[PDB]
Design a binder for this molecule. Structure first.
Ligand SMILES: O[C@@H]1[C@@H](O)[C@H](O[C@@H]2CO[C@@H](O)[C@H](O)[C@H]2O)OC[C@H]1O
Ligand SMILES: O[C@@H]1[C@@H](O)[C@H](O[C@@H]2CO[C@@H](O)[C@H](O)[C@H]2O)OC[C@H]1O
Length: 389
């Protein structure tokens, strides 16, 4: 039968966390109850540890972000903010690829834009929200409906201005993790020095485009965050569809194991295709996220483990360095049960608990696994995610 090895001595990326977006200008804010469902880690709560928000172009809208951002922080989360457009007096229009009236930040206003981002940072700080990071731009390379930045404009801002931002600087938030938006920053010593978090979105991003050798070479001291996605679609009322929801778990496994990502952040938290339904309950897509978010907590470290021990079975493992305990998340996308011997050499652990989601149950506690020495034999139900803790 199939075997996997978890190697607790081969440490990979430190986990920062998991979460999603609030946008109270475009859609309704989270309600009081929804804030707790998202950021609490009790029964029937998602255990999210990252909130993302927008930086409005009109400072008279900033007050609308405060209640949800404050609640998330109270429940243990960190908050990152991204702008879509500068204030209109800083914007000029230009023609891009033949399309007129497109927006870019006026070059002669780069310093004024820093002051706008800093004014947001200071406004949120005055209201009890200490931002973990602020982005230069949401999707500078997909800005048909907002503000475009070329790779060079992004680079010049990163090199010449981003040092003046009073927060961690996240860039470039390419819509698809396109390396042409980030390579210039990683290759310029001043820009790289001004960077703190390499942020990327995953819209259309394949497994082969998840590794990033340049970042493994140049990225020492920088974090690596996947700051927006929905998968496998944004279809109306799709969030409970099965086995489609297993794609959410698989995308997260891939982000962690193939991309070495430290954070994975959904789009709108509350939406008919999101982790929280419009009625405030958790969706099947939400339970997929929860198999990671509720158990792989911030500061756990991913470790090397057999990622794909048999066809349609995917394994990731994270270690809590406080006690060398292990959290393993195993996805079985097969329509048949799979029996695996999981070897964890040199562990003192002899018993694992397990929680299982299928099409018919959500995070169901099942019977404990007893090890024979350092080997744990596990049977995975068909079309399931199991978290072993
Ligand atoms: O003018 C604003 C639009 O730009 C906005 O459209 C959003 C663009 O980002 C997409 O990810 C959203 O799905 C889409 O709704 O909507 C509000 C409007 O004021
Ligand atoms: O809301 C937008 C998405 O609709 C957009 O979707 C991607 C566009 O490029 C395609 O190659 C991808 O398959 C698709 O996921 O991503 C950006 C986002 O703002």
């Amino acid at each position: 039968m199939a075997s996997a090895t978890i190697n607790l001595s081969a440490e990979k990326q430190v986990i920062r966390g998991f979460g999603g977006m609030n946008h109270p200008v475009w859609i309704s804010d989270l309600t009081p109850q929804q804030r707790d469902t998202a950021f609490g880690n009790g029964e029937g709560q998602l255990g999210f540890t990252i909130l993302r928000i927008h930086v409005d172009e009109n400072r008279n809208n900033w007050s609308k972000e405060v209640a949800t951002a404050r609640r998330a922080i109270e429940l243990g989360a960190i908050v990152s903010a991204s702008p879509w457009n500068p204030p209109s007096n800083m914007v000029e229009t230009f023609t891009r690829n033949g399309v007129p009236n497109q927006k870019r930040l006026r070059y002669d206003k780069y310093g004024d834009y820093v002051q706008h981002l800093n004014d947001f940072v200071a406004y949120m700080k005055s209201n009890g929200v200490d931002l973990y990071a602020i982005s230069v731009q949401n999707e500078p390379d997909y800005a048909h409906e907002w503000t475009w930045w070329t790779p060079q404009e992004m680079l010049r801002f990163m090199r010449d201005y981003a040092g003046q931002i009073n927060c961690r600087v996240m860039a470039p938030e390419s819509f698809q993790y396109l390396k042409n938006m980030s390579d210039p920053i990683l290759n310029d010593p001043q820009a790289l020095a001004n960077l703190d978090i390499l942020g990327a979105h995953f819209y259309g991003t394949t497994v082969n485009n998840m590794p990033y050798p340049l970042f493994e070479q140049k990225g020492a001291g920088k974090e690596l965050w996947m700051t927006a996605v929905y998968v496998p679609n944004s279809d109306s009322n799709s969030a409970d569809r099965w086995p489609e929801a297993l794609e959410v778990a698989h995308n997260m496994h891939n982000a962690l194991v193939e991309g070495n990502f430290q954070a994975y952040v959904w789009w709108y938290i509350r939406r008919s295709y999101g982790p929280m339904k419009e009625d405030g309950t958790i969706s099947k897509r939400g339970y997929m996220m929860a198999h990671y978010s509720k158990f792989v907590r911030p500061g756990y470290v991913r470790v090397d483990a057999t990622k794909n021990p048999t066809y349609n079975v995917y394994l990731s493992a994270c270690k809590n360095k406080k006690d060398n305990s292990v959290v393993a998340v195993v996805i079985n996308k097969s329509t048949e049960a799979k029996t695996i011997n999981i070897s964890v050499p040199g562990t003192s652990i002899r018993k694992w608990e397990r929680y299982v989601t299928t099409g018919s149950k959500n995070l169901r506690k099942e019977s404990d696994i007893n090890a024979s020495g350092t080997t744990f034999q596990v049977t995975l139900e068909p079309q399931s995610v199991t978290t072993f803790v």
